[PDB]
Amino acid sequence: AYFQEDVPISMEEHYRIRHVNIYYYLEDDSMSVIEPVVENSGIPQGKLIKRQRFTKNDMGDHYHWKDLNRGINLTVYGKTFRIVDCDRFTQDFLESQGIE
Amino acid sequence: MRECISIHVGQAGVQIGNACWELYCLEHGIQPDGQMPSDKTIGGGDDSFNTFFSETGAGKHVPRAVFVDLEPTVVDEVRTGTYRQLFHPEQLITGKEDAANNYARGHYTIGKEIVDLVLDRIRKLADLCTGLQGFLIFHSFGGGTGSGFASLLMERLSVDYGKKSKLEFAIYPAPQVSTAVVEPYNSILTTHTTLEHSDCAFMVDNEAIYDICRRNLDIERPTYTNLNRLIGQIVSSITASLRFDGALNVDLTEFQTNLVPYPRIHFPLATYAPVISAEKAYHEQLSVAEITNACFEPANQMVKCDPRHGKYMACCMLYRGDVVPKDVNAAIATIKTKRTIQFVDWCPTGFKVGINYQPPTVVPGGDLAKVQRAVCMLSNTTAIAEAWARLDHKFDLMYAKRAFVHWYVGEGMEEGEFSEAREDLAALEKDYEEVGVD
Amino acid sequence: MRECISIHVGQAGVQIGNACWELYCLEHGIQPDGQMPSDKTIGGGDDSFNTFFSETGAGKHVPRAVFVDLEPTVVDEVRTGTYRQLFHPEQLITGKEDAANNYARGHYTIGKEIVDLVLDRIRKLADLCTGLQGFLIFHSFGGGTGSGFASLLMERLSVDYGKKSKLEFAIYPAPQVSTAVVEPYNSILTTHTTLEHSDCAFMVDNEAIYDICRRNLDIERPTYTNLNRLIGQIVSSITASLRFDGALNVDLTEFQTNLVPYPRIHFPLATYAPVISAEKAYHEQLSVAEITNACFEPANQMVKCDPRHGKYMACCMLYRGDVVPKDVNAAIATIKTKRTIQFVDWCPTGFKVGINYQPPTVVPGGDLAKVQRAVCMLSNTTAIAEAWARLDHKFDLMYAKRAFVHWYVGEGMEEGEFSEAREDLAALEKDYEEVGVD
Amino acid sequence: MFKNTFQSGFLSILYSIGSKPLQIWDKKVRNGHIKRITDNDIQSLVLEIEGTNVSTTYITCPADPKKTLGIKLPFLVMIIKNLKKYFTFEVQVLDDKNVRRRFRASNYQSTTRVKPFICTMPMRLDDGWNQIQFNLSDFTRRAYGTNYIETLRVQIHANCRIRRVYFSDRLYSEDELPAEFKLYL
Amino acid sequence: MREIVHLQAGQCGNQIGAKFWEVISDEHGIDPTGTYHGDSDLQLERINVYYNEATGGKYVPRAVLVDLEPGTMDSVRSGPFGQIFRPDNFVFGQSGAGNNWAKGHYTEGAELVDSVLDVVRKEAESCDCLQGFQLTHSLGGGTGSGMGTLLISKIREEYPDRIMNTFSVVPSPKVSDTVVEPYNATLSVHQLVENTDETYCIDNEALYDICFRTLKLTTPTYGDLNHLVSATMSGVTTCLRFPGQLNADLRKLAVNMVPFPRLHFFMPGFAPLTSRGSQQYRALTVPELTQQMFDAKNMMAACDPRHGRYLTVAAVFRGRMSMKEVDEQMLNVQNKNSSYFVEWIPNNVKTAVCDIPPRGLKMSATFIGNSTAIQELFKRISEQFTAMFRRKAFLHWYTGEGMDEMEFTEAESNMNDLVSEYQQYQD
Amino acid sequence: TTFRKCYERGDFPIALEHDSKGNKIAWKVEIEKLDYHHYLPLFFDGLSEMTFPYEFFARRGIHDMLEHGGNKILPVIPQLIIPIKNALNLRNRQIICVTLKVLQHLVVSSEMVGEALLPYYRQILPILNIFKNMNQQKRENIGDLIQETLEAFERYGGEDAFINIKYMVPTYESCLLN
Amino acid sequence: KIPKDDLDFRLATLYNHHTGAFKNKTEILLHQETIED
Ligand SMILES: Nc1nc2c(ncn2[C@@H]2O[C@H](COP(=O)(O)OP(=O)(O)OP(=O)(O)O)[C@@H](O)[C@H]2O)c(=O)[nH]1
Ligand SMILES: Nc1nc2c(ncn2[C@@H]2O[C@H](COP(=O)(O)OP(=O)(O)OP(=O)(O)O)[C@@H](O)[C@H]2O)c(=O)[nH]1
Ligand SMILES: Nc1nc2c(ncn2[C@@H]2O[C@H](COP(=O)(O)OP(=O)(O)OP(=O)(O)O)[C@@H](O)[C@H]2O)c(=O)[nH]1
């Protein structure tokens, strides 16, 4: 996945786009977002949102793996994210589960 | 940051060592090739392995340990094993000559020309490390090569680096089983040399480890594949705080401070409560209550000692898995209400808790159960002095009839150094009851 | 809450408890594997099973019983049966040596080294239980292993836990049929040991059990499968109050307080009225009135005692199914007006009614009828001393000619304790006639 | 112990002139001997204590470990003949803070190690009936920086030939020492 | 790496070494031609402990054959593996021994020691770092005792830092055939006890009984006795060549075996010996292995330790076992006869586990022991010396050679001291 | 009390002169040459020691050393607080009556006394703050001794010692500028 | 009297963990006059 942000002051640009990575724990439906760590970056990298269940709507529902297709936009406590693609076992399992 | 270096002297200490990285590579999913799948965890070497392995931009997890051995037998076939590509060739420090169980032979004859090479390894490992809290020394008191070679190096690493921790782990000599009558000689030589330099030493005994196997694991014929797994899960549990986190995180420095009361005696006892077969845990339930009873059940200890013949000073419990403080603090409170459990009156509180949410996992081709709640129990009691009491009446018989001394004095020792240990030991026992005397 | 622990001692007692537990899995729909379908009933173990099974987070119903036996044959075959995966391996307490029908051999020679282990079971079940009203002991007087081994343990369970109930169920010895001539020996040994510790002991006799089969069930060739089925129904009926509810709910404590008049004698008789063949149930009708007469019909008792030579003290009717107070209270009122029914004048009322709405279900592959209105008839009378009077004139003969004594004095016993049993029985019978004397 | 007795002057606890002096000297005989031979240069009975191992056989005060010593004096002089063997001894005392401590002196010792409970000291000396001098107050302040209070128990090991054991408060000269204390060759 | 060079001396040792070497080749699977048929990777790696390399994959044995009679060496040269032994290694003399110790110790040895030392130093420089050497010979054998006593002495000062194994067979107690044989024995053993550390004690009469006990086939060949004993010496050498968690160094072993220097004489012990039907009538279990391992009948060396007590015992196990069964078996035997050990040392057991079974069977073991049963050995020789030194029988020859009674005096005196030494240590 | 047995054991050379209904004490060894560091705080534990005749030794020596050991208490002050503080915790009027009389001579014994006591004010003032008025024939009134201590202490205390007492003692008045 | 397993094992075992070696459950838990002695 990826996310954007806007520069309010600095010399160079108006906006900053940043790539992230989405991790869905299948065992307990906990989730974690880890940005890749890059050098000379001028931003702190590492763990953005620790392992937990992401509240989907306001009742307290959680983003369950049934409702995750490609190219889906989702909000995680403010920032809205966008799904890019998947990795080998993911589509295999998800098409085994059946998500077109 | 939070890292350490592990040391393995003696061919006894290497196959047991091999197991834990065989264990350690699984929970990180490390493939035998040396790299992850297409998933991204590589970089400058900073992830769950950074505390254990060194997976630089080259992408190969380099474990932070050195395997030293004096015989090329056990080191070569493992150099032809499965993960040997992961292993750095010359941190598998091989040797061409043995110590013949002789403490001093591995301490004087050949150790001189080899440790300097080992010193090169540790400094070239020291420079790359950042925090390096301490070291994980794996050895054996009854070491044909583990005993003597370790003694000189632990001296040399003490003198150059006396500012960091040194963690010692060795198989305690079997009290009534003796595969070598030379063992009491070299072992007491280690103890008297190590008592004033070792930071925290820990002992285990295989007999009760075997006794556990056919008690609850119900295996009448295990192997070290099982044994190295059982000790490997013990060191994995204590290192989970470095790997993962939980309600609170605990570190070896707090372990040292809160476990050892006074200098010299720094020799606690470990125990793992959820030791059970797969099918037993299958249709039974694990909870803090019974495992607390099991961890404090006297026969569950792998060290041959009756706690009622001694008295408790410290008890460290490290709960790995999904637990809550409510039952735990209630459960330990009930333990404090127990009357047979006789802590020394000097310490009102003697409980050191470390909570980690991560469940302990199974091993491929394994024998263990499916643990959701585990605890590693680290305790020290005065019921241990009988072991040294066993050794001295063992040792004193031989020394009067000075058996095998011609072997030692044949290659360059005298009587005094052997004299030293006995009152050093006699000091140890005499210190043990006076602290026991309230 | 409302739970109890079943005890099954003796390879006589093993199939029946198995049959009872087999019955119990049906009415709850328990699959032989140990789990329900995708329907949600699992948890920490709190539902209709929480009183009988232990279906923890693992999801496997663990029955709250321990099967103890001295010969491995029958206990291993059930360990190879259909529900063995449900059963706990060392709850199936096995033995390797028999008592050879000797009460003392199973009470002295081997019971010592086994009672500690089975105690480890009962104590380890104690923690998981919460209310644990009492126990369900299944045994036999002429126990080749049931008699002696139970006697030691009931003594041990009496002394440690004297604050709760203990329910005893044993096949009463066949009056005129003797499968063992030593059976009178161990039987009387059980009685005098149990008179001062047992809470409520209930007896049953196999001969009349067969007599029912070819009278109304129309079976001239039944088997234990049938025999164990009906007694399994008996205990199922009395335990339905724990399982389900009704117009009123009653408990063994109320049973104890109201059934036993005075200390010592606590030996009433059970009876189940709607025992009938399917065809006789088919083109006839069942209702409270006739089953009340049938349950009070003297030949419907499975004990060879005719009430008209005794007198009634206590009578309990436990109606499981669709009943209303109106016909029940009116019908019993007619029974009180009956003249042949000779209650003792000491008790104006001796009626304890238990109403349960749940219909008694049939078992697949069974032989019973489909009962809408059931009743288990618990009653005590003075026509029971006939059985003991049968035993003594039997016993007084052999003891004078002291047959087989060389066996018992051979393995370490004497005659004084055999001497005690005779006046104890003489005491019991004279109490029976004295309370018979108004 | 016998603190009710007066610490003034000398405190001769062991002395071989007595027929049976072993009352408070508990002996742990182990592959050695207990023998009373006469001498040549002092031509008197002495305490022959020898054994195959030093730690195996050793004489101690008090006879009963449960009871203390109770001695004020900070000096001590031991009469011993150099037997050309492995002789050692130890003393366990009490300091100001009431933490107990031992002073283990051994002839073979190559170094001097201080443990918060036990101090290991070397003994090198000459041949013949050589003598002993130690200021207990000195070692406490030098080693632990503490203040000496009381003797609690003293243990004497094997490979030795003893004539008399006595304490002192100062460095008493040979003058006030009586004739039996004025040892003559 | 650490290697061993073998010495083959004496006319029996000529038959000894031939069987010992062929077993190794068959164990390692080399053809008689010398072209190894690659079948086991482990035996391929740990064969350089004994063999060096020749061109064409031929494994040259690092052994030396020495004798005086051409016929015997020609016979072994014509054996199934004579082609694998080197004519370079065939050193000999132009004389018949006369089966005389002094001639083989002073007269004929003088002009042959120069060559053999020039020989052995060549292979010594050929190899890298020896553990030591082993010598197959006999104590009652004339040429072997004469040569070996000379050689062991000279190689003492040459390399006093190596594993100096000696292998000798005790002549038949009932009949020695050679009648000057005890004279040869005392002369040999005098230097032997001075110049050996390891010495194996083997007797033929026990072997004949062992045939009567387990072989049960009436008429063996002496090669079958060679077959039996060569299997025994192979077992102790299996430790070095084979992997598995067992410490192989004889120095690892000898220091565990030698509490005091004058203990040099050691007895073998072997594992399952099977009769004609019992190959398929035996349940191969460690208990019955250990039972048969510790059988006074399974003893083959000299005589029954039942007369005395047990000083040191060391069993090496070869096959697929575990430490636990030997552990409980050790407790069983420890609890079996605790008093029959010496109170001098408890826990006198030293065990090694070779995970690689032999070729032909799975469960196996070799036992090396030290009990107080050698007193019979040198007391039975004692009265022979006194009886024949009573009247100097067969003595004019040795005086003609240049010997006299004086050496015999300390020769028996040395032996008599050993009598008390074994006696005092136990009794 | 460790000190009580110390001269039950007997190492301190002190005698006394003899009497029927009063008090007077004598000596054996001159104090000025004996010790003011190793024996000083030990004997102040005697003030914490209240048992006849061992109590008779207590006050005598403490006052007597003051007139004969003036300018030697300076480097010993921190150790001397402990016997005082323990006596404070003792909670008995007769003991406290003794202490203040002792402290009265202590404060005016020599120079620098209160000036050296500046770090050690908040260990004695608190419990005296709470004694202020808890209560001529024999100088019995505790409250009078309390103000006597405070007055001489503040005038000799210096510049802020007074307001330090005022901080501790909220009733406290001045004896210098009011 | 006795509440639970840990005390049950501990109060009556007659098993010296230092002395007892390669023992079995029955041999491990061994009570006293509780049974008969
Ligand atoms: N740590 C460990 N010990 C073992 C293992 N198997 C057996 N042991 C025991 O560990 C001891 C090994 O110690 P040593 O023989 O002194 O080992 P060493 O110092 O490296 O020298 P060696 O004699 O060559 O083995 C033996 O006495 C065995 O009782 C094992 O797999 N790991
Ligand atoms: N409870 C019960 N009793 C049975 C059953 N089948 C037969 N019996 C009767 O119960 C008696 C069994 O008693 P015992 O032989 O002493 O049983 P035990 O004490 O467990 O020991 P065993 O001799 O091995 O059977 C027999 O004499 C039968 O008459 C049965 O299935 N259940
Ligand atoms: N080869 C062989 N030797 C045997 C046999 N039986 C007994 N021996 C003895 O083994 C001894 C050792 O042989 P060598 O050391 O080579 O003997 P030697 O030096 O030539 O002098 P001799 O003993 O006279 O033969 C001989 O003395 C034989 O008596 C046998 O069956 N085969």
PDB file of all heavy atoms in Angstrom, chain B residues 208-226:
ATOM      1  N   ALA B 208      17.053 -36.192  35.369  1.00  0.00           N
ATOM      2  CA  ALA B 208      15.667 -35.783  35.552  1.00  0.00           C
ATOM      3  C   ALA B 208      15.063 -35.250  34.263  1.00  0.00           C
ATOM      4  O   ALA B 208      13.851 -35.374  34.056  1.00  0.00           O
ATOM      5  CB  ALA B 208      15.562 -34.735  36.660  1.00  0.00           C
ATOM      6  N   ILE B 209      15.883 -34.651  33.399  1.00  0.00           N
ATOM      7  CA  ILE B 209      15.419 -34.305  32.059  1.00  0.00           C
ATOM      8  C   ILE B 209      14.951 -35.560  31.337  1.00  0.00           C
ATOM      9  O   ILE B 209      13.897 -35.575  30.690  1.00  0.00           O
ATOM     10  CB  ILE B 209      16.526 -33.579  31.277  1.00  0.00           C
ATOM     11  CG1 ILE B 209      16.880 -32.256  31.956  1.00  0.00           C
ATOM     12  CG2 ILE B 209      16.098 -33.343  29.836  1.00  0.00           C
ATOM     13  CD1 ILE B 209      18.150 -31.623  31.436  1.00  0.00           C
ATOM     14  N   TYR B 210      15.728 -36.640  31.449  1.00  0.00           N
ATOM     15  CA  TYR B 210      15.263 -37.933  30.964  1.00  0.00           C
ATOM     16  C   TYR B 210      14.068 -38.430  31.765  1.00  0.00           C
ATOM     17  O   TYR B 210      13.133 -39.010  31.201  1.00  0.00           O
ATOM     18  CB  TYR B 210      16.392 -38.958  31.012  1.00  0.00           C
ATOM     19  CG  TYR B 210      15.894 -40.367  30.810  1.00  0.00           C
ATOM     20  CD1 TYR B 210      15.385 -40.773  29.586  1.00  0.00           C
ATOM     21  CD2 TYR B 210      15.920 -41.288  31.848  1.00  0.00           C
ATOM     22  CE1 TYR B 210      14.916 -42.057  29.402  1.00  0.00           C
ATOM     23  CE2 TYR B 210      15.458 -42.577  31.671  1.00  0.00           C
ATOM     24  CZ  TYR B 210      14.958 -42.956  30.443  1.00  0.00           C
ATOM     25  OH  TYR B 210      14.495 -44.238  30.255  1.00  0.00           O
ATOM     26  N   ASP B 211      14.086 -38.226  33.083  1.00  0.00           N
ATOM     27  CA  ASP B 211      12.976 -38.683  33.913  1.00  0.00           C
ATOM     28  C   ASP B 211      11.680 -37.991  33.516  1.00  0.00           C
ATOM     29  O   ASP B 211      10.609 -38.605  33.509  1.00  0.00           O
ATOM     30  CB  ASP B 211      13.288 -38.446  35.390  1.00  0.00           C
ATOM     31  CG  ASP B 211      14.435 -39.303  35.886  1.00  0.00           C
ATOM     32  OD1 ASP B 211      14.604 -40.428  35.372  1.00  0.00           O
ATOM     33  OD2 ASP B 211      15.171 -38.850  36.787  1.00  0.00           O
ATOM     34  N   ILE B 212      11.764 -36.703  33.175  1.00  0.00           N
ATOM     35  CA  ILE B 212      10.596 -35.978  32.682  1.00  0.00           C
ATOM     36  C   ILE B 212      10.066 -36.636  31.415  1.00  0.00           C
ATOM     37  O   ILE B 212       8.850 -36.754  31.216  1.00  0.00           O
ATOM     38  CB  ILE B 212      10.951 -34.499  32.447  1.00  0.00           C
ATOM     39  CG1 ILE B 212      11.009 -33.743  33.776  1.00  0.00           C
ATOM     40  CG2 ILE B 212       9.954 -33.843  31.504  1.00  0.00           C
ATOM     41  CD1 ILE B 212      11.810 -32.462  33.714  1.00  0.00           C
ATOM     42  N   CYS B 213      10.975 -37.099  30.553  1.00  0.00           N
ATOM     43  CA  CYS B 213      10.597 -37.594  29.233  1.00  0.00           C
ATOM     44  C   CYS B 213       9.587 -38.734  29.328  1.00  0.00           C
ATOM     45  O   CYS B 213       8.598 -38.767  28.590  1.00  0.00           O
ATOM     46  CB  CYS B 213      11.845 -38.040  28.472  1.00  0.00           C
ATOM     47  SG  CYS B 213      12.823 -36.684  27.787  1.00  0.00           S
ATOM     48  N   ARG B 214       9.825 -39.683  30.227  1.00  0.00           N
ATOM     49  CA  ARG B 214       8.887 -40.782  30.410  1.00  0.00           C
ATOM     50  C   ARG B 214       7.933 -40.561  31.578  1.00  0.00           C
ATOM     51  O   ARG B 214       7.117 -41.443  31.864  1.00  0.00           O
ATOM     52  CB  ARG B 214       9.637 -42.112  30.577  1.00  0.00           C
ATOM     53  CG  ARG B 214      10.181 -42.415  31.965  1.00  0.00           C
ATOM     54  CD  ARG B 214      11.330 -41.507  32.351  1.00  0.00           C
ATOM     55  NE  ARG B 214      11.960 -41.945  33.590  1.00  0.00           N
ATOM     56  CZ  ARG B 214      11.505 -41.655  34.800  1.00  0.00           C
ATOM     57  NH1 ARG B 214      10.414 -40.932  34.973  1.00  0.00           N
ATOM     58  NH2 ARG B 214      12.161 -42.105  35.865  1.00  0.00           N
ATOM     59  N   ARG B 215       8.007 -39.414  32.255  1.00  0.00           N
ATOM     60  CA  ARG B 215       6.991 -39.080  33.249  1.00  0.00           C
ATOM     61  C   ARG B 215       5.754 -38.474  32.596  1.00  0.00           C
ATOM     62  O   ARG B 215       4.674 -39.072  32.610  1.00  0.00           O
ATOM     63  CB  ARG B 215       7.563 -38.122  34.297  1.00  0.00           C
ATOM     64  CG  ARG B 215       8.174 -38.820  35.494  1.00  0.00           C
ATOM     65  CD  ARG B 215       8.544 -37.838  36.591  1.00  0.00           C
ATOM     66  NE  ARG B 215       9.704 -37.029  36.235  1.00  0.00           N
ATOM     67  CZ  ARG B 215      10.153 -36.009  36.955  1.00  0.00           C
ATOM     68  NH1 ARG B 215       9.541 -35.623  38.061  1.00  0.00           N
ATOM     69  NH2 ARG B 215      11.244 -35.363  36.555  1.00  0.00           N
ATOM     70  N   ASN B 216       5.897 -37.301  31.997  1.00  0.00           N
ATOM     71  CA  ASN B 216       4.763 -36.619  31.393  1.00  0.00           C
ATOM     72  C   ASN B 216       4.797 -36.607  29.875  1.00  0.00           C
ATOM     73  O   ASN B 216       3.745 -36.764  29.251  1.00  0.00           O
ATOM     74  CB  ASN B 216       4.666 -35.178  31.914  1.00  0.00           C
ATOM     75  CG  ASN B 216       5.952 -34.404  31.737  1.00  0.00           C
ATOM     76  OD1 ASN B 216       6.895 -34.878  31.110  1.00  0.00           O
ATOM     77  ND2 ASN B 216       5.997 -33.204  32.298  1.00  0.00           N
ATOM     78  N   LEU B 217       5.966 -36.426  29.263  1.00  0.00           N
ATOM     79  CA  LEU B 217       6.085 -36.618  27.825  1.00  0.00           C
ATOM     80  C   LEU B 217       5.922 -38.077  27.421  1.00  0.00           C
ATOM     81  O   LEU B 217       5.666 -38.351  26.244  1.00  0.00           O
ATOM     82  CB  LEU B 217       7.428 -36.083  27.322  1.00  0.00           C
ATOM     83  CG  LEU B 217       7.499 -34.597  26.952  1.00  0.00           C
ATOM     84  CD1 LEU B 217       6.590 -34.302  25.766  1.00  0.00           C
ATOM     85  CD2 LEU B 217       7.163 -33.687  28.127  1.00  0.00           C
ATOM     86  N   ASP B 218       6.074 -39.008  28.367  1.00  0.00           N
ATOM     87  CA  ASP B 218       5.766 -40.423  28.170  1.00  0.00           C
ATOM     88  C   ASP B 218       6.648 -41.069  27.107  1.00  0.00           C
ATOM     89  O   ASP B 218       6.218 -41.997  26.417  1.00  0.00           O
ATOM     90  CB  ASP B 218       4.288 -40.621  27.823  1.00  0.00           C
ATOM     91  CG  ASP B 218       3.362 -40.046  28.877  1.00  0.00           C
ATOM     92  OD1 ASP B 218       3.771 -39.982  30.055  1.00  0.00           O
ATOM     93  OD2 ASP B 218       2.230 -39.652  28.526  1.00  0.00           O
ATOM     94  N   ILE B 219       7.880 -40.596  26.960  1.00  0.00           N
ATOM     95  CA  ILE B 219       8.829 -41.154  26.004  1.00  0.00           C
ATOM     96  C   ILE B 219       9.831 -41.980  26.798  1.00  0.00           C
ATOM     97  O   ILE B 219      10.634 -41.438  27.566  1.00  0.00           O
ATOM     98  CB  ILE B 219       9.526 -40.067  25.180  1.00  0.00           C
ATOM     99  CG1 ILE B 219       8.531 -38.976  24.789  1.00  0.00           C
ATOM    100  CG2 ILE B 219      10.161 -40.674  23.939  1.00  0.00           C
ATOM    101  CD1 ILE B 219       7.478 -39.443  23.810  1.00  0.00           C
ATOM    102  N   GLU B 220       9.785 -43.301  26.618  1.00  0.00           N
ATOM    103  CA  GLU B 220      10.754 -44.164  27.281  1.00  0.00           C
ATOM    104  C   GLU B 220      12.108 -44.133  26.583  1.00  0.00           C
ATOM    105  O   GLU B 220      13.137 -44.361  27.228  1.00  0.00           O
ATOM    106  CB  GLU B 220      10.219 -45.596  27.362  1.00  0.00           C
ATOM    107  CG  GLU B 220      10.296 -46.396  26.066  1.00  0.00           C
ATOM    108  CD  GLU B 220       9.227 -46.014  25.053  1.00  0.00           C
ATOM    109  OE1 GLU B 220       8.643 -44.915  25.161  1.00  0.00           O
ATOM    110  OE2 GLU B 220       8.967 -46.827  24.142  1.00  0.00           O
ATOM    111  N   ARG B 221      12.135 -43.857  25.280  1.00  0.00           N
ATOM    112  CA  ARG B 221      13.377 -43.804  24.508  1.00  0.00           C
ATOM    113  C   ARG B 221      13.458 -42.518  23.694  1.00  0.00           C
ATOM    114  O   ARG B 221      13.305 -42.537  22.467  1.00  0.00           O
ATOM    115  CB  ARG B 221      13.504 -45.020  23.589  1.00  0.00           C
ATOM    116  CG  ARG B 221      13.402 -46.363  24.283  1.00  0.00           C
ATOM    117  CD  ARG B 221      14.585 -46.623  25.208  1.00  0.00           C
ATOM    118  NE  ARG B 221      14.290 -46.326  26.604  1.00  0.00           N
ATOM    119  CZ  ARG B 221      15.115 -46.578  27.612  1.00  0.00           C
ATOM    120  NH1 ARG B 221      16.295 -47.141  27.414  1.00  0.00           N
ATOM    121  NH2 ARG B 221      14.743 -46.267  28.851  1.00  0.00           N
ATOM    122  N   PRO B 222      13.702 -41.371  24.346  1.00  0.00           N
ATOM    123  CA  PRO B 222      14.073 -40.171  23.580  1.00  0.00           C
ATOM    124  C   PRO B 222      15.522 -40.170  23.112  1.00  0.00           C
ATOM    125  O   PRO B 222      16.253 -41.150  23.280  1.00  0.00           O
ATOM    126  CB  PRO B 222      13.817 -39.024  24.566  1.00  0.00           C
ATOM    127  CG  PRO B 222      13.839 -39.649  25.900  1.00  0.00           C
ATOM    128  CD  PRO B 222      13.291 -41.027  25.719  1.00  0.00           C
ATOM    129  N   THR B 223      15.928 -39.058  22.500  1.00  0.00           N
ATOM    130  CA  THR B 223      17.297 -38.795  22.071  1.00  0.00           C
ATOM    131  C   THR B 223      17.608 -37.341  22.392  1.00  0.00           C
ATOM    132  O   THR B 223      16.743 -36.617  22.893  1.00  0.00           O
ATOM    133  CB  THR B 223      17.486 -39.049  20.573  1.00  0.00           C
ATOM    134  OG1 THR B 223      16.743 -38.072  19.833  1.00  0.00           O
ATOM    135  CG2 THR B 223      17.000 -40.434  20.191  1.00  0.00           C
ATOM    136  N   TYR B 224      18.846 -36.895  22.109  1.00  0.00           N
ATOM    137  CA  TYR B 224      19.102 -35.466  22.295  1.00  0.00           C
ATOM    138  C   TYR B 224      18.312 -34.609  21.322  1.00  0.00           C
ATOM    139  O   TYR B 224      18.147 -33.411  21.569  1.00  0.00           O
ATOM    140  CB  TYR B 224      20.571 -35.010  22.206  1.00  0.00           C
ATOM    141  CG  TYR B 224      21.708 -35.713  22.925  1.00  0.00           C
ATOM    142  CD1 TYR B 224      22.714 -36.338  22.208  1.00  0.00           C
ATOM    143  CD2 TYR B 224      21.926 -35.502  24.289  1.00  0.00           C
ATOM    144  CE1 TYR B 224      23.810 -36.896  22.844  1.00  0.00           C
ATOM    145  CE2 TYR B 224      23.007 -36.077  24.945  1.00  0.00           C
ATOM    146  CZ  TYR B 224      23.961 -36.759  24.212  1.00  0.00           C
ATOM    147  OH  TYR B 224      25.070 -37.302  24.825  1.00  0.00           O
ATOM    148  N   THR B 225      17.852 -35.171  20.202  1.00  0.00           N
ATOM    149  CA  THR B 225      16.904 -34.432  19.375  1.00  0.00           C
ATOM    150  C   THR B 225      15.773 -33.891  20.233  1.00  0.00           C
ATOM    151  O   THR B 225      15.323 -32.754  20.055  1.00  0.00           O
ATOM    152  CB  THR B 225      16.345 -35.319  18.264  1.00  0.00           C
ATOM    153  OG1 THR B 225      15.535 -36.356  18.839  1.00  0.00           O
ATOM    154  CG2 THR B 225      17.469 -35.908  17.432  1.00  0.00           C
ATOM    155  N   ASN B 226      15.298 -34.710  21.168  1.00  0.00           N
ATOM    156  CA  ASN B 226      14.362 -34.231  22.174  1.00  0.00           C
ATOM    157  C   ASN B 226      15.071 -33.387  23.228  1.00  0.00           C
ATOM    158  O   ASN B 226      14.611 -32.292  23.570  1.00  0.00           O
ATOM    159  CB  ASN B 226      13.661 -35.422  22.818  1.00  0.00           C
ATOM    160  CG  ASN B 226      12.996 -36.317  21.797  1.00  0.00           C
ATOM    161  OD1 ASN B 226      13.360 -37.483  21.649  1.00  0.00           O
ATOM    162  ND2 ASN B 226      12.024 -35.775  21.074  1.00  0.00           N
TER     163      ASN B 226
END
